[PDB]
Amino acid sequence: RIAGVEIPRNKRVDVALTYIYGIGKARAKEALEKTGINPATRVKDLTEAEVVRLREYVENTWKLEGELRAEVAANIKRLMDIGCYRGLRHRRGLPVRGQRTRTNARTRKGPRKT
Amino acid sequence: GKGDRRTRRGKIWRGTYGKYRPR
Amino acid sequence: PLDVALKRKYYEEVRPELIRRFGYQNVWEVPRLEKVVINQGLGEAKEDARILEKAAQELALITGQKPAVTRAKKSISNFKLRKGMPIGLRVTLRRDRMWIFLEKLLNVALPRIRDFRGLNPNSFDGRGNYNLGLREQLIFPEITYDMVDALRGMDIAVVTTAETDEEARALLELLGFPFRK
Amino acid sequence: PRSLKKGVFVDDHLLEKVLELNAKGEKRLIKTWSRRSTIVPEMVGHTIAVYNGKQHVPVYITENMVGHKLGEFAPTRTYRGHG
Amino acid sequence: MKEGIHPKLVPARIICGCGNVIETYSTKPEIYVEVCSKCHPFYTGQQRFVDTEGRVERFQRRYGDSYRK
RNA sequence: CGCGGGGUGGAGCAGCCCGGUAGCUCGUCGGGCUCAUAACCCGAAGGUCGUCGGUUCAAAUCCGGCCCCCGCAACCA
RNA sequence: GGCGACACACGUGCUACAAUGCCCACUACAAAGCGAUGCCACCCGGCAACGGGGAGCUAAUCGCAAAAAGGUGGGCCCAGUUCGGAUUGGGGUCUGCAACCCGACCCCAUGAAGCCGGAAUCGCUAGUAAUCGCGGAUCAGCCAUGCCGCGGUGAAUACG
RNA sequence: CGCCUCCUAAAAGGUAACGGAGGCGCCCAAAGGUCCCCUCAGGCGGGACGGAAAUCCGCCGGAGAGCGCAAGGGUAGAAGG
Ligand SMILES: [Zn+2]
């Protein structure tokens, strides 16, 4: 379908774009503007030429699925290499943005371990 | 929810202004 | 038999290009595609969904040729598979279906690959025989996402008349296999 | 981060000592207390022992660490786990 | 070929996002494809398709040189 | 050493006969209740089934060896 | 530099697990307070934070400042979702000499657990509870979901 | 305590010991007959899950595999699939 994935036919295009990794609510409301496409249209109601236009536009305006993930890991991996505190935090699986490690680090630490 | 910045709800609860809650 | 553009590319340019590149004394000295083997070592249907013939149907769609079933050559404790148990499908595409399937592969299958930076330039037998693998089966245009239910990858063993991997990768390169390196 | 409209902050004594070795050839590992300071592209190839609060941690400044603060690389804390 | 088991092949029209038609043989006469060889990144000079930076780091230190020396 | 039996989580025992998956009580951890402790309640964890080889696709679970422990005999004088 | 660590454990709170809902655009309706190196109107730029202009305001008169929920209209259709916003990558604004540890805020993307919570346990008898928002202290800035207050709407139940 | 395998057992066979090792007290309606077809184990390299070891490919292999079960004999120019 689209760059790496598919949007459900039964959903509007706005939510449709969002299922792409690297596409949130913001750009979703944007590609419709830059492609002049009705947001209210379901994916089951989308025309080929509009889609390929959509496909052509968005899939080069940004990198979304694989090309986007690599930069993240590239950024993250290089931090481990540079030994930065940020990278230092990642190598411990700890909250890298200065959060409080003493309590409430579950989202970064997952299951609690007595 | 209230704690979501991107919602105008959040910037109300958070008490801020931005792309999603102008003045 | 039937006409296939890619094979036509083999005769038209690939043959003379290889001959120039190597000066083969005889045209039988130049590489060729013996066959193209397709494997799916499922390892899942052997226990449950033992009629996953639907997967064989997918192979038939991609190949126009129903694959034969491969069973366990012996039982295993770890691999929960008693001997004589279907564990993987297999089809052997040859001349016409060979060039056809390969043509759909390069023209569509590879460019549909997620983050396809190219083929391994190293996945060679050593005898001039290339192998590779897939993690899903919805790459091929015959297969649609609607018809797909589970991602069965596969393996492809393209065998070549050539003796070295040199002339092999030379050939498929002339065939335009996009090598990631 | 620091307002790029505002200048990119680096301590005067730090940068001058940097350019000095840039003037007088790469040498002379530099003690420093300016963890708040930002690495500058000129700093690449230099080695500096940044102070952690107790010691000066010698950090070799490469290009790969230019756009950062110096305190990032002298970890001011010691954690080895539990048990 | 065992006459009755193999799904019969036909001429098959490939249609890319380029609208690229590619005549082949398949079990579907008319077929569309989001991608072809004439559009794939790795075939289109790699094209960068979003980002031509190519490991932008490190610098890329623009907004720099504001130091007083 | 001659015979029979056994040697499973921290403890005591189960699963062995029928090899495809080891369970119970206690105990431990955490929490709850209490002014606190015990009791109690909730939750949680956790077992080369002596040891070594073979049999097996697979052995606690089969086989054989060794070790330990146990019971029985070690006799006619 | 540390007080911000972090295998863990407990308390107190906030946000949710959604349709009596979420989101969006418009229209309301407060109180109580603060403000001269502060409120800053209004203009412009900028997605925005914010920045540049810049009036008034020394205070019932200027501003902070929109109250919010509510009403209106639309979308969403039960979805780990247009719920959820945690984490993280990047790009920025602002204060501050200096935001790495160790600020806040704006923007994109990422979109975690979570489907009402065991044992158990808490507050509340009326404008109370619940929910909605506003102000102030400290303070350059803020780690404030806290605290102290203000108002909006507004319950059930007490046999004993 | 009966029968099978090997050594004992002295190049015929047979050959004892409370000698040294293991087995059997069945099983297969196909594990039987016949025709036709194929050839293993193993090693290396390549191969999504997937591994040491699934299935696939190529390459090297006389049999070291397998041949229902003990051992031996026999065996792919099949008794093996
Ligand atoms: Zn194309």
Side-chain angles (χ1 to χ4, degrees), chain A residues 1-4 6 8-28 30-33 35-43 45-55 57-114, chain B, chain C residues 1-43 45-46 48-50 52 54-57 59-72 74 76-79 83-116 118-145 147-180, chain D residues 1-17 19-23 25-26 29-53 55-83, chain E residues 1-27 29 31-46 48-50 52-54 56 58-64 67-69:
Chain A
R1 290 294 306 275
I2 201 166
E6 176 175 0
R9 291 179 181 176
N10 290 318
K11 293 185 183 294
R12 297 178 65 188
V13 298
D14 54 359
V15 300
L17 279 300
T18 61
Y19 288 166
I20 293 298
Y21 182 83
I23 293 171
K25 181 66 70 176
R27 296 177 183 175
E30 180 58 28
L32 297 173
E33 294 177 353
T35 60
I37 299 168
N38 185 0
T41 61
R42 299 292 185 183
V43 175
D45 295 331
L46 299 174
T47 68
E48 178 63 25
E50 291 175 352
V51 172
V52 297
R53 185 184 304 112
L54 185 67
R55 179 178 293 107
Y57 173 77
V58 63
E59 296 177 354
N60 286 317
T61 60
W62 303 285
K63 67 182 184 181
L64 301 176
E65 290 296 328
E67 188 182 4
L68 195 154
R69 297 182 189 277
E71 182 178 3
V72 173
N75 296 318
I76 299 165
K77 174 64 173 64
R78 67 183 297 277
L79 296 176
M80 292 185 182
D81 298 331
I82 60 172
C84 68
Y85 177 76
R86 181 181 294 171
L88 293 172
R89 301 296 294 164
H90 288 90
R91 289 185 289 177
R92 295 292 179 86
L94 290 176
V96 183
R97 299 184 186 181
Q99 292 82 16
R100 176 258 188 80
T101 66
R102 184 175 177 180
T103 65
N104 292 319
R106 296 299 90 197
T107 301
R108 183 74 178 177
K109 291 170 70 175
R112 293 180 181 177
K113 301 177 183 180
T114 297
Chain B
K2 280 78 173 178
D4 192 357
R5 287 177 177 86
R6 294 181 186 272
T7 64
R8 182 186 61 85
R9 177 68 67 193
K11 292 183 185 292
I12 294 170
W13 183 84
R14 182 70 62 80
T16 64
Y17 286 96
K19 184 178 184 293
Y20 296 94
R21 179 173 180 265
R23 68 187 70 189
Chain C
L2 54 82
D3 184 75
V4 294
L6 196 157
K7 179 179 178 180
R8 185 176 297 279
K9 180 179 177 181
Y10 176 72
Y11 288 159
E12 291 176 350
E13 297 178 354
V14 180
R15 302 290 300 279
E17 186 61 25
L18 294 178
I19 299 166
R20 192 276 305 277
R21 294 173 59 85
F22 298 96
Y24 298 95
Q25 295 300 109
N26 188 357
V27 299
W28 299 107
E29 298 174 355
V30 306
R32 293 185 301 276
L33 293 177
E34 184 64 26
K35 84 278 284 183
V36 175
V37 172
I38 296 169
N39 186 4
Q40 288 187 358
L42 272 294
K46 86 288 189 187
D48 58 356
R50 185 176 296 109
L52 285 175
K54 185 266 184 181
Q57 184 63 41
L59 269 294
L61 300 174
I62 297 166
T63 64
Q65 179 176 358
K66 181 263 290 182
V69 177
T70 64
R71 296 180 184 178
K74 65 183 180 293
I76 293 170
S77 68
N78 295 321
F79 299 164
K83 185 177 183 294
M85 190 177 292
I87 63 171
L89 299 178
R90 186 269 304 280
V91 67
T92 303
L93 292 176
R94 294 184 185 273
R95 299 171 182 267
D96 291 329
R97 293 185 297 279
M98 184 180 72
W99 294 104
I100 297 169
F101 171 74
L102 298 176
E103 188 173 1
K104 292 188 285 186
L105 186 66
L106 287 179
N107 292 319
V108 174
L110 298 181
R112 182 174 292 169
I113 297 170
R114 295 178 60 83
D115 291 329
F116 175 74
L119 297 172
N120 183 2
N122 300 319
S123 175
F124 287 97
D125 183 73
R127 301 292 185 183
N129 299 320
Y130 188 82
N131 294 320
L132 65 87
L134 277 298
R135 72 280 193 192
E136 70 182 0
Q137 73 278 17
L138 59 87
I139 295 297
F140 297 95
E142 293 82 1
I143 298 300
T144 190
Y145 182 76
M147 66 180 74
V148 65
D149 59 356
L151 279 71
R152 282 85 62 192
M154 62 186 71
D155 289 329
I156 293 169
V158 56
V159 179
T160 301
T161 62
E163 292 293 327
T164 66
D165 297 338
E166 296 295 330
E167 291 180 353
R169 185 173 181 271
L171 176 58
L172 301 177
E173 189 175 4
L174 272 67
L175 293 176
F177 286 182
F179 293 100
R180 180 180 53 78
Chain D
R2 183 173 178 80
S3 177
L4 57 83
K5 180 180 73 177
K6 292 171 71 174
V8 177
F9 178 76
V10 171
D11 287 333
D12 184 76
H13 60 88
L14 183 64
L15 187 151
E16 181 179 1
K17 296 175 184 179
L19 294 176
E20 294 174 354
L21 293 169
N22 287 315
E26 292 292 328
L29 172 62
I30 298 170
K31 290 169 67 175
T32 189
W33 288 260
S34 295
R35 297 175 63 90
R36 62 182 178 177
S37 294
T38 301
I39 294 90
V40 77
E42 294 82 3
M43 294 177 182
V44 178
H46 293 88
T47 303
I48 287 88
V50 175
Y51 192 69
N52 59 5
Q55 295 176 356
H56 293 279
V57 175
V59 175
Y60 176 71
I61 293 86
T62 69
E63 68 183 1
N64 291 321
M65 65 188 76
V66 175
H68 291 89
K69 299 291 182 69
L70 281 73
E72 302 180 358
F73 301 96
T76 183
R77 295 176 187 176
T78 63
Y79 176 73
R80 295 179 181 92
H82 297 92
Chain E
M1 296 177 72
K2 293 181 182 179
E3 297 177 354
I5 68 168
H6 301 288
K8 187 174 181 180
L9 291 170
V10 300
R13 294 184 61 83
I14 297 168
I15 304 301
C16 175
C18 292
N20 188 1
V21 178
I22 299 89
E23 291 180 353
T24 186
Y25 284 155
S26 174
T27 60
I31 295 170
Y32 299 97
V33 297
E34 72 280 16
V35 63
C36 74
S37 67
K38 305 296 189 293
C39 65
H40 184 271
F42 185 77
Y43 300 156
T44 182
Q46 308 304 116
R48 303 281 68 70
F49 276 171
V50 57
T52 310
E53 290 81 2
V56 65
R58 167 61 68 194
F59 67 99
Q60 296 293 322
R61 203 259 180 279
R62 304 309 90 201
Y63 302 95
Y67 65 97
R68 298 296 303 276
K69 183 261 183 66

